[PDB]
Amino acid sequence: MDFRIGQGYDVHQLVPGRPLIIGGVTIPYERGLLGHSDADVLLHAITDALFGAAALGDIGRHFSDTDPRFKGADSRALLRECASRVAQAGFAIRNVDSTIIAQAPKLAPHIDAMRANIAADLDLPLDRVNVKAKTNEKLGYLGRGEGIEAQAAALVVRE
Amino acid sequence: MDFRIGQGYDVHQLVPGRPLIIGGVTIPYERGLLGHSDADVLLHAITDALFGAAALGDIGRHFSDTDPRFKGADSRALLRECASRVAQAGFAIRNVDSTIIAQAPKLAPHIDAMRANIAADLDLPLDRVNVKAKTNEKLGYLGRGEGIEAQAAALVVRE
Amino acid sequence: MDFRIGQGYDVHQLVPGRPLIIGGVTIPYERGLLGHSDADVLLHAITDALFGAAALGDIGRHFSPRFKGADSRALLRECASRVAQAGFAIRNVDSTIIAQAPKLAPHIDAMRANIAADLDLPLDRVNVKAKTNEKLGYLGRGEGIEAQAAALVVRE
Ligand SMILES: Nc1ccn([C@@H]2O[C@@H](COP(=O)(O)O)[C@@H](O)[C@H]2O)c(=O)n1
Ligand SMILES: [Mg+2]
Ligand SMILES: [Zn+2]
Ligand SMILES: [Zn+2]
Ligand SMILES: [Zn+2]
């Protein structure tokens, strides 16, 4: 059994005038994450952890701005494509764990919807997908609500 | 061979008039970590990694940060209950690794005592538990002594 | 079947005068990482992940002596030796570099090769990823550069 681990990181600024989308879930809130597309910090971190575990580089190498098929794709579509490319390299996904660091808003009521989005997109049972939520105890830009961070870890195995 | 990985993150402010308890070790210092519990940043991150690997949510959902029973709570007891919930869910713990980021004080002399506490609490041999120490090179709120961070990784197996 | 996971972290200040060395690769830039050796943030993070996985402490505990003055690729090979000595084989390494500037993409494959050579691993078991910090905090301002690592080992 040829197991591999991957880890992922993402951060985006938290600004008025964009929706707040994390884990494929749109969360009603006065601000949203700034970046390309939906700036879904959680799905990007997971996407990188999966590419990382398959040793397939990173999210930036896979999906560019000029990409004719993936310009106009949201972060769930990128995740589904990532899962396909991980399978192409010979790996089946075993589990995902993650942490969202956000001072606000409260994320607890939206976690299980995030897990269901991720589980569906990866064709995993719900109980192989975990998402945890943290504040930053008012420390740094995260503590001041200037951005939201996601951290992810993934376990795969070669078929 | 049903292996799972979890990862954990925690940070707490460093303030005067608090005990400095990391990995269950009371460390002499002019300041201590601030929280609802004893604010043991390391144990909390490990606890989160273990809940994450078993896909049981997070430390927030299991133990409320606004509940008199948990005020000043011994984080080793929270870690021991976590281990119990991980077992009941059908997993055995294989290893824990972790990092504490603190600019001060020196943590190296206390590392082995931390490992001893964690190993006892998780009923693990010492050689499956690791704790590492880092400063933040005087960068950010961590580099300025305003808080302490912990990171953790945990490998479990469904048994 | 006795698998173990390890995780690593490192950060270093970005300063004028110093060469920028990440993953053993000298990258043209007006600033470089401040530290004892070449202050190779990436290699230190991977080194820590490896000691962590084998439960052998950390980089600072191993190289607190002779290893004062060593470059990070030397420390990494030595780390691998001590990990092998302890009875563990390395299965894979993954890592992320967080740097606002410069562009790291053109240098990633070369870092990969350096790490794989140093760990005596095939290229397809070593991975390096690049991130910016979206202009946030000391990382976003180019005050420093961070690396994260994760490692899987098996006790032989
Ligand atoms: N310093 C950096 C940071 C990111 N990159 C590349 O571009 C990145 C995309 O930038 P962000 O994802 O940080 O917005 C990474 O995915 C990586 O492929 C780089 O080449 N050098
Ligand atoms: Mg950080
Ligand atoms: Zn992103
Ligand atoms: Zn805590
Ligand atoms: Zn270093």
In a nutshell, what does this entry contain?
Chain C: The record marks 36, 132 as: Transition state stabilizer. 3 copies of one chain form a homotrimer. With 159 residues, chain A is an alpha+beta fold.
CATH class of chain A: Alpha Beta
Give the CATH H-level superfamily of chain A. Answer: 2-C-methyl-D-erythritol 2,4-cyclodiphosphate synthase
- How would you describe the oligomerization state of the chains in this entry? homotrimer
CATH topology (fold) name of chain A = 60s Ribosomal Protein L30, Chain: A
**What characteristic shape of chain A results from the CA principal axes?**
globular
Note down, in words, how this protein is organized.
Chain C: One of its GO terms (molecular function) is 2-C-methyl-D-erythritol 2,4-cyclodiphosphate synthase activity. The structure is a homotrimer. The first copy, chain A, is α+β, with helices and mostly antiparallel strands. Chain A has a single domain (1-159), classed as 60s Ribosomal Protein L30, Chain: A (2-Layer Sandwich). Helix content of chain A is 30%, strand content 32%. Chain A is built from five helices and seven strands. In chain A, the strands form two sheets. A five-stranded mixed beta sheet of chain A has the order 4-1-7-5-6. In chain A, strands 2-3 form a two-stranded antiparallel sheet. In chain A, helix 1 (41-53) runs parallel beside helix 3 and helix 3 (75-88) runs parallel beside helix 4 (111-122). The radius of gyration of chain A is 15 Å and the shape is globular. Chain A starts with a strand and ends with a strand. In chain A, 57% of the residues are buried. Chains in contact: A-B, A-C, B-C. The interface between A and B is medium-sized, with 31 and 32 residues. The structure holds cytidine-5'-monophosphate (C5P), magnesium ion and zinc ion (3 copies). Residues 10, 12, 35, 39, 41, 44 of chain B line the site of one zinc ion.
